[PDB]
Design a binder for this molecule. Structure first.
Ligand SMILES: *[C@@H](C)[C@H]1/C(=C/C2=NC(=C\c3[nH]c(C[C@H]4NC(=O)C(C=C)=C4C)c(C)c3CCC(=O)O)/C(CCC(=O)O)=C2C)NC(=O)[C@@H]1C
Ligand SMILES: *[C@@H](C)[C@H]1/C(=C/C2=NC(=C\c3[nH]c(C[C@H]4NC(=O)C(C=C)=C4C)c(C)c3CCC(=O)O)/C(CCC(=O)O)=C2C)NC(=O)[C@@H]1C
Ligand SMILES: *[C@@H](C)[C@H]1/C(=C/C2=NC(=C\c3[nH]c(C[C@H]4NC(=O)C(C=C)=C4C)c(C)c3CCC(=O)O)/C(CCC(=O)O)=C2C)NC(=O)[C@@H]1C
Ligand SMILES: *[C@@H](C)[C@H]1/C(=C/C2=NC(=C\c3[nH]c(C[C@H]4NC(=O)C(C=C)=C4C)c(C)c3CCC(=O)O)/C(CCC(=O)O)=C2C)NC(=O)[C@@H]1C
Ligand SMILES: *[C@H](C)[C@H]1/C(=C/C2=NC(=C\c3[nH]c(C[C@H]4NC(=O)C(C=C)=C4C)c(C)c3CCC(=O)O)/C(CCC(=O)O)=C2C)NC(=O)[C@@H]1C
Ligand SMILES: *[C@H](C)[C@H]1/C(=C/C2=NC(=C\c3[nH]c(C[C@H]4NC(=O)C(C=C)=C4C)c(C)c3CCC(=O)O)/C(CCC(=O)O)=C2C)NC(=O)[C@@H]1C
Ligand SMILES: C=CC1=C(C)[C@@H](Cc2[nH]c(/C=C3N=C(/C=C4\NC(=O)[C@H](C)[C@H]4CC)C(C)=C\3CCC(=O)O)c(CCC(=O)O)c2C)NC1=O
Ligand SMILES: C=CC1=C(C)[C@@H](Cc2[nH]c(/C=C3N=C(/C=C4\NC(=O)[C@H](C)[C@H]4CC)C(C)=C\3CCC(=O)O)c(CCC(=O)O)c2C)NC1=O
Ligand SMILES: C=CC1=C(C)[C@@H](Cc2[nH]c(/C=C3N=C(/C=C4\NC(=O)[C@H](C)[C@H]4CC)C(C)=C\3CCC(=O)O)c(CCC(=O)O)c2C)NC1=O
Ligand SMILES: C=CC1=C(C)[C@@H](Cc2[nH]c(/C=C3N=C(/C=C4\NC(=O)[C@H](C)[C@H]4CC)C(C)=C\3CCC(=O)O)c(CCC(=O)O)c2C)NC1=O
Ligand SMILES: C=CC1=C(C)[C@@H](Cc2[nH]c(/C=C3N=C(/C=C4\NC(=O)[C@H](C)[C@H]4CC)C(C)=C\3CCC(=O)O)c(CCC(=O)O)c2C)NC1=O
Ligand SMILES: C=CC1=C(C)[C@@H](Cc2[nH]c(/C=C3N=C(/C=C4\NC(=O)[C@H](C)[C@H]4CC)C(C)=C\3CCC(=O)O)c(CCC(=O)O)c2C)NC1=O
Lengths: 380, 177, 46, 164, 76, 164, 177, 164, 164
């Protein structure tokens, strides 16, 4: 039993952060929970207001001339009767929101943006998208913003004083949905005006068409390609800056590939993962030279014990004793240090690491070989 | 998601058939062996915490570079996530053994789990090893032939249910490969 | 039975010749900077 | 589908828990009742052509305005299109008498059932009159047994209330 | 001085961003293919060729030189 | 409190449906499953002192370092606080029997228990040493009936999976 | 994100080593010149509002079709947004000069910048020169050779900091190239 | 990580401001407090194997029950994987002293340790009796300087506060 | 007000942490750089009538068009509100050198300043012609010390940059 409650449930009475956030990617990057305290200074009412305009508008450029639409409900927040969950309801019902994300958007793109902005979560399955379409067609835009917020999910996750954040929940109910939100928040330096084509489709940046890719992955349950989860991603804004030995980041697609060097690499992984299947079976019994003598070298191991440390005079000479737990076995400092150098020293781990760099290089060398007719080539 | 009893229904409507005495026979025998299935799913959930530590640590001893600096179970953060993705898969498998159908599994975990580990940089076939050890533990518990624990049952043949739970554990293997 | 066998003949070997072809010190097959670039056909202007 | 098993493996999946002793007992409840209601399914499928025959006219034994000019029963072939519909709703009862719950009713016979009926001039008052003469005509020692008769008598009243 | 840094497997030499990583050569040398031309840091473009200009009048030369009186402020 | 009845009418509340005949499926099985688990209720509730006595020295024989100076059993009025703690857990087990779910254990005994013991320097391995022992002094046809002991020995290692 | 002190921690972690004798000496010379680094960051945040108009308008005079109709810097909102990405870039290069390491450039400034320019239609050849002009300004302010503003420092050379800030202005100039 | 520099660049970047004088002021305190804590990191780099060896057998002398069959010290393979964990915690404290704040102990040594020690049944009092031993062995003018012993014993108590 | 002690407490409360050794190490920089900005704060506390005078006319020497009719400085009663404003900015720079960060200048003199000067037709090029004159009038061995003329000049063009 590792996790005890998910983030879709309310927090219990005995924690500060939820449990699933404590070892997730939540701790590693900027996608955290900013809370408004009880009594707010006017300087730290800006720290809650700049975080709302980050999330609810998705890194858009709110100019000064168009932030004058919001001063009526800005001040209603700065006074303190609009909570954060009620400020974002009026901000979604605004005019500058409906111009940006509604009046040129296909109905799939508007629902998946509302899933990113109001909830912290890309759309899960398809009949959830379908029922939120069926509010708007029967009740209009007005009650449809009450669908996201006036359900159990906003109250349990964000309460009424936390600004929405992209959740890194740990447990994902399909495992496809961890990439759906990873492709939707695609970059710190991105925004939905760019990703939806709403600047190139229109005139001088206005009159944009907010069209969506990945529509078919909602209907047909199909995974996201791995490039759209590792290139521009929340996993780079929350990069752990480790020393991962399979380094997960994808290399740039090279110019000048050749079908020769793909064929050596493709055969090369088949020599390695066939060897891995015949080396993982061999280990775990006969890998160890000093293991069959361990029961004999342990039976005669204890003799001439010693209480006061420093006996075994050996003819009346000093010759003391260690009596530690480690050194009673005859071990040194290099006995526990060998576990740190088994990354390449080992034979089962050297094969697996060398396999995983090869399928890394093969996944980008193959995909660069998808451009065909006017290709100028090389001599290596 | 679907069940066993829904599965005859989601096939019969494609012909629009009244399900009379046509194909009910695997359902009257289903509820007949309900108790000896409930006696078999209880065997896993009573031992599930000591299964996934048995299995994840067993994957480590076969590949000890996973805990050296660099490996994908090195720190306390990487170990606590891997110990959690072992718990998620064993939980959906116990759901599929509970309904007797696989469509709780491949729509709720196996869809896109292959592309996730390619993104996160988790090595594939060592994670295959950890599901493989959990397969060997489930068929031991159901047949009551684990080495170091026994539970008491009414005597009877349960080699058919142990093949069913093994038939789901390699569907996880076909996903993440 | 291994993955990376050592190279050598005689007793205490694995079956792989020295240097993988009995060539301890192999000759240089690569060519000069100026002609390996002219051979690829994309460093023409350079 | 809304079965006994799909709740329990989702009332635990939302909480992220394993099947507990409350969870396995919920399928033990889907054994003893399950006999006398899987017994309620083959009797439906046997003389299925008669329970639509006795309801295909009682729907018209209330209303004669359906056979007026302009209406939905204005001809013969749409009465047969009506018979195809009353063929369906008791057939979906045959589907939810083997599942255990009301899964295929609210997935295949209740979803959208209003917005086609009022749109296409399909008055529900005669739909429920077809199911009314089904209901209390059921002679509980002739058609089935007693405890098998409540399981058939329950399900058709679920879409009495759902379709009106 | 030139800067070379490969972070996240993105090797760039100054403003290059290498496309083809390695091509081994004769005397233990390496070749990389870059997508741009690297300009030196303190590079000043040589100016276009021009015609030599000469002072038209010599009195206008003296008319722009300040005198000691103007340097002291005793004159305009 | 998580019961069988509690988890079905909560999922009914999430949709807004009435108590279904699908929801009457489950509590019928509850009456037959309570022939077992209510028998083991008063078997605990007539003999709980002799159980919790034996589990105490089973904990203290395995971990006899707890009676060292500075540890969590260093005087008699710390040992006395221990012997009622394992009677608290046996009391919640008697509550989960008559309710029939994990509810009375994961609310009054589990949630937050890893926070209290990590601060009060109580080793949680000493807690499972008295729960795994009384898991298996139950010999089946002498202590109770055969089906009561399989619910007794199911809540007991819901506990062991939680604390370990 | 990392700085100069934590970059040598994650390289020593890659060898399972303690940050010891030969690796603690390069960090003691990072603080021995730590006041020239604070003196060099202050040169850039002082003149920052005129650094991003000396550069953006110097790009318009070389590629004058940017303000021609249909151009990328044509309206007021398009010109306003170019000046906000002009100073965002200078804001992140100042953090890299302060921290001594280009992690913040890779983790959050450039994380999607080439893709978001193609998705908008920003000409990436002109936006090199908006970053390349700011490189000429910043090495003039650090070596104190700006030809219309001088600031008062102690004596010595800041040749090494002027070279390092040049390395951050063309990691941006190559990760959108 | 969590350093002096990373807190003043992430609070600035949340606001949208250049490095102001309040930021460069705090990085000057990284220059005065540097040589105190870069003096305790070098004392730990060159003497760790004698510290870890002495801090590790304090765990087993205090709790000798661990070497029983059944516990976390039953063979020589688990005992070597015990002294390594002390050498992992001691190496992270050396990384915290070099970075400046509690960056490495949070993300690499704490974040998840409450879960992997419950699952593998590792007692956590055995972890802290090794860290508290080294905090109490610090002879503050002999081992290092007096201000280095503050910076050293600060992360030592930060770790005991996180595991207890 | 934004300063060193506010930003390391607001950041260590966003996570819910006790003050760590990177929060204390920031405030040690507040001690080393206080002896240079306090003798640039009292140096302005005495001589501030002569600096609002010498800089208040530096704009009106530059922008001599301001005294034409219809303009800002057309009459003496508007000129007196103008000399009052350069007094207001010099008072806040005296406040900023006391706190250590730009909290006073932000919360009182900057926040909302663009909303008013556009409404009341005040040319902000005249406002920066005053503040830039005070900047380069300084003779750093004579007026104050060297590192005090760093701190005084730092907030002087932070105000210029926040008006430009
Ligand atoms: C003895 C075999 C144990 C042990 C027990 C000790 N527990 C101590 C305090 C304590 N225990 C609990 C949990 C308990 N109380 C409840 O109400 C319930 C369930 C409803 C449970 C499980 C609490 C809340 C407390 C703190 C308050 C109190 O003292 O009652 C304790 C005293 C330690 C101390 O206070 O310093 C002991 C000795 N300790 C052992 O060594 C084994 C594991
Ligand atoms: C290179 C960019 C310059 C240059 C830089 C030098 N600066 C030197 C010393 C120095 N600078 C400061 C101020 C700085 N430290 C802070 O804490 C803050 C703000 C919080 C700032 C702006 C200080 C305090 C010092 C130390 C001397 C002093 O003023 O008391 C310096 C001297 C060498 C050294 O100190 O290591 C140099 C060379 N000088 C140049 O020639 C170019 C243009
Ligand atoms: C000995 C004094 C200890 C003790 C230690 C054991 N630890 C075991 C496994 C283990 N420990 C960790 C945490 C450790 N790994 C890290 O990378 C870092 C920080 C960078 C830390 C603190 C992990 C992740 C694991 C699992 C993987 C592994 O084998 O290293 C262990 C083996 C238990 C088992 O195999 O069942 C032991 C015996 N045990 C003791 O009694 C005291 C507490
Ligand atoms: C160094 C040789 C300089 C230089 C300095 C001169 N300043 C003169 C007058 C003057 N200076 C100030 C500013 C002084 N008061 C302050 O409060 C601060 C700091 C905040 C400073 C630096 C004022 C206000 C005045 C006018 C009134 C007064 O004298 O106190 C001055 C005399 C000439 C004059 O008064 O017009 C000199 C020579 N002059 C230089 O050429 C270099 C750059
Ligand atoms: C353990 C046996 C593996 C291993 C696992 C790691 N997984 C890491 C993150 C992670 N794991 C999953 C899988 C799981 N979570 C789910 O929600 C579902 C389905 C609903 C499944 C199957 C996911 C989706 C993620 C990403 C989500 C997140 O991080 O919040 C992980 C951490 C990597 C990191 O911190 O960068 C590890 C180490 N790694 C192994 O080495 C063994 C083979
Ligand atoms: C100016 C030097 C360029 C130029 C810039 C334009 N950018 C436009 C939109 C835009 N720019 C960015 C970049 C910026 N935002 C970030 O978060 C980061 C990194 C942290 C950077 C560098 C973004 C995200 C966007 C989209 C903003 C939005 O969603 O509104 C833009 C068009 C704006 C509009 O259409 O309204 C322009 C013109 N264009 C140029 O010609 C020069 C070269
Ligand atoms: C709520 C929880 C709940 C349960 C766990 C089950 C508990 C359970 N299992 C069985 C009963 C049984 N269980 C088994 C199962 C097995 N015997 C073996 O030898 C194998 C090891 C194992 C199968 C893998 C068999 C063979 C029977 C009796 C035959 C049968 O049920 O058809 C019975 C019927 C006998 C009795 O009255 O006790 C019951 C109630 N029912 C429940 O209501
Ligand atoms: C290098 C380290 C290392 C390990 C950790 C183990 C891990 C391990 N255990 C099993 C095999 C198993 N593992 C378990 C797990 C458990 N047994 C129980 O009774 C408990 C409930 C639980 C431990 C808490 C079970 C039940 C089996 C099946 C056989 C049996 O134990 O009776 C297998 C598969 C069979 C095999 O290949 O040997 C492996 C790899 N082996 C290793 O080489
Ligand atoms: C699936 C379940 C199922 C049923 C219940 C029956 C329902 C049913 N009963 C009758 C037909 C009949 N049912 C009855 C019985 C009675 N009539 C009454 O009014 C009394 C209340 C009751 C005495 C017990 C009688 C007497 C007939 C003959 C004609 C009639 O009265 O309707 C008919 C007409 C065609 C036929 O003969 O089948 C049908 C469909 N058929 C089914 O397929
Ligand atoms: C077509 C229009 C056009 C321009 C606007 C300028 C823009 C410009 N300035 C510089 C070069 C520079 N630009 C500045 C910028 C400034 N100087 C300051 O002190 C202020 C703070 C800020 C003006 C607001 C600085 C400091 C240098 C370095 C040299 C110096 O001025 O001392 C360069 C690079 C060198 C070069 O190519 O000539 C360019 C293109 N040049 C042009 O051809
Ligand atoms: C990383 C930091 C670091 C440390 C703190 C020490 C910890 C330490 N101290 C001693 C060793 C010692 N430490 C002391 C100090 C004291 N004994 C007392 O009774 C006084 C209370 C106290 C003075 C403050 C003495 C007297 C010895 C030698 C005798 C002994 O080992 O106990 C030893 C044995 C090897 C040696 O002599 O160094 C070690 C590992 N080493 C380190 O590398
Ligand atoms: C604490 C910080 C702080 C400030 C700086 C001032 C800022 C400020 N100045 C003015 C008000 C004014 N400010 C000026 C300023 C100038 N006239 C000129 O010729 C130049 C452009 C410039 C100075 C040389 C004038 C003339 C007015 C009066 C304008 C009017 O009332 O129409 C007002 C409107 C209210 C009033 O008249 O008092 C405010 C809020 N107030 C503050 O609280």
């Amino acid at each position: 039993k590792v996790v005890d409650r998910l983030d879709s449930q309310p927090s219990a009475a005995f924690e500060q952060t939820k449990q699933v956030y404590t070892f997730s990617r939540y701790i590693l990057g900027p996608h955290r929970a900013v809370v408004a305290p009880v009594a707010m200074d006017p300087s730290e009412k800006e720290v809650v207001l700049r975080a709302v305009y980050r999330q609810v508008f998705g890194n858009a450029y709110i100019m000064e001339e168009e932030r004058a639409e919001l001063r009526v409900m800005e001040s209603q927040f700065l006074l303190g009767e609009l909570s954060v969950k009620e400020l974002v309801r009026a901000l979604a019902k605004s005019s500058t929101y409906k111009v940006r994300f509604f009046e040129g958007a296909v109905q799939y793109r508007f629902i998946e943006l509302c899933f990113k902005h109001l909830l912290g979560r890309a759309p899960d399955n398809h009949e959830e998208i379908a029922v939120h379409m069926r509010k708007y067609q029967q009740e209009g835009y007005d009650a449809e913003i009450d669908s996201y917020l006036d359900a159990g999910e906003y109250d349990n996750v964000f309460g009424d004083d936390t600004v929405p954040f992209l959740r890194f929940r740990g447990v994902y109910t399909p495992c496809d949905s961890f990439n759906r939100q990873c492709a939707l928040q695609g970059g710190w330096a991105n925004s939905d005006k760019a990703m939806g084509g709403a600047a190139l489709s229109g005139y001088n940046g206005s009159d944009g068409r907010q069209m969506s890719t990945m529509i078919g992955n909602y209907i047909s349950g199909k995974p996201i390609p791995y490039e759209k989860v590792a290139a521009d991603t929340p996993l780079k804004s929350t990069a752990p800056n480790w020393y991962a030995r399979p380094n997960p980041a994808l290399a740039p697609q090279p110019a000048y590939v050749s079908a020769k060097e793909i064929a050596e690499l493709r055969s090369r992984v088949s020599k390695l993962e066939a060897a891995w299947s015949v080396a993982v079976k061999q280990s775990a019994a006969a890998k160890d030279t000093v293991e069959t003598w361990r029961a004999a070298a342990k039976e005669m191991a204890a003799m001439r014990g010693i209480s006061p440390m420093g006996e075994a005079y050996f003819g009346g000479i000093a010759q003391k004793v260690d009596n530690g737990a480690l050194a009673q076995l005859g071990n040194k400092a290099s006995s526990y240090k060998k576990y740190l150098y088994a990354i390449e020293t080992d034979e089962v781990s050297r094969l697996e690491v060398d396999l995983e760099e090869a399928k890394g290089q093969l996944r980008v060398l193959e995909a660069a070989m998808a451009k065909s007719t006017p290709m100028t080539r090389t001599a290596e | 998601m679907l069940d066993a009893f829904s599965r005859v229904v989601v096939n019969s409507d494609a012909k629009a058939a009244y399900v009379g005495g046509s194909d009910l026979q695997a359902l009257k025998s289903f509820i007949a062996d309900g108790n000896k299935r409930l006696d078999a799913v209880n065997s896993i959930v009573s031992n599930a915490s000591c299964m996934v530590s048995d299995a994840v640590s067993g994957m480590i001893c076969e590949n000890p570079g996973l805990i050296s600096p660099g490996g994908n179970c090195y720190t306390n953060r990487r170990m606590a996530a891997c110990l959690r993705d072992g718990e998620i898969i064993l939980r959906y498998v116990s759901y599929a053994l509970l309904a007797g159908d696989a469509s709780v599994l491949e729509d709720r975990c196996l869809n896109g789990l292959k592309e996730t580990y390619i993104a996160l940089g988790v090595p594939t076939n060592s994670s295959i090893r950890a599901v493989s050890i959990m397969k060997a533990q489930a068929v031991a518990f159901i047949t009551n032939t684990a080495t170091e624990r026994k539970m008491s049952f009414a005597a009877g043949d349960c080699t058919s249910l142990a093949s069913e739970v093994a038939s789901y554990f390699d569907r996880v293997g076909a996903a993440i490969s | 039975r291994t993955a990376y066998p050592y190279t050598g003949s005689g007793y205490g070997s694995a079956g792989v010749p020295y240097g993988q072809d009995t060539y301890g010190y192999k000759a240089t097959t690569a060519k000069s900077i100026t002609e390996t670039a002219a051979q690829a056909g994309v460093f023409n202007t350079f | 589908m809304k079965s006994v098993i799909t709740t329990v493996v989702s009332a635990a999946d939302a909480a992220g828990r394993f099947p507990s002793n409350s969870d396995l007992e919920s399928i033990q409840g889907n054994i003893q009742r399950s006999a006398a209601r899987l017994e309620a399914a083959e009797k439906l499928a046997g003389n299925h052509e008669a329970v639509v025959k006795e309801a295909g006219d009682a729907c018209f034994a209330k209303y004669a305005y359906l056979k007026n000019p302009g209406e939905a029963g204005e001809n013969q072939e749409k009465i047969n299109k009506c018979y195809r519909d009353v063929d369906h709703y008791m057939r979906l009862v045959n589907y939810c008498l083997v599942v255990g719950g009301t899964g295929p009713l609210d997935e295949w016979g209740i979803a959208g059932a209003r917005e086609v009926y009022r749109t296409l001039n399909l008055p529900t008052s005669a739909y429920v009159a077809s199911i009314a003469y089904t209901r209390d005509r059921l002679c509980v020692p002739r058609d089935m047994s007693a405890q098998a008769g409540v399981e058939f008598s329950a399900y058709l009243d679920y879409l009495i209330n759902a379709l009106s | 001085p030139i800067s070379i840094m490969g972070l996240n497997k993105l090797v760039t030499a100054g403003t290059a961003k290498v496309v083809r990583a390695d091509v081994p050569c004769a005397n233990g040398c390496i070749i990389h293919a870059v997508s741009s031309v690297i300009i030196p840091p303190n590079y000043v473009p040589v100016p276009q060729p021009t015609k030599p200009v000469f002072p038209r009048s010599v009195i206008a030369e003296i008319a722009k030189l300040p005198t000691p009186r103007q340097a002291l402020g005793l004159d305009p």
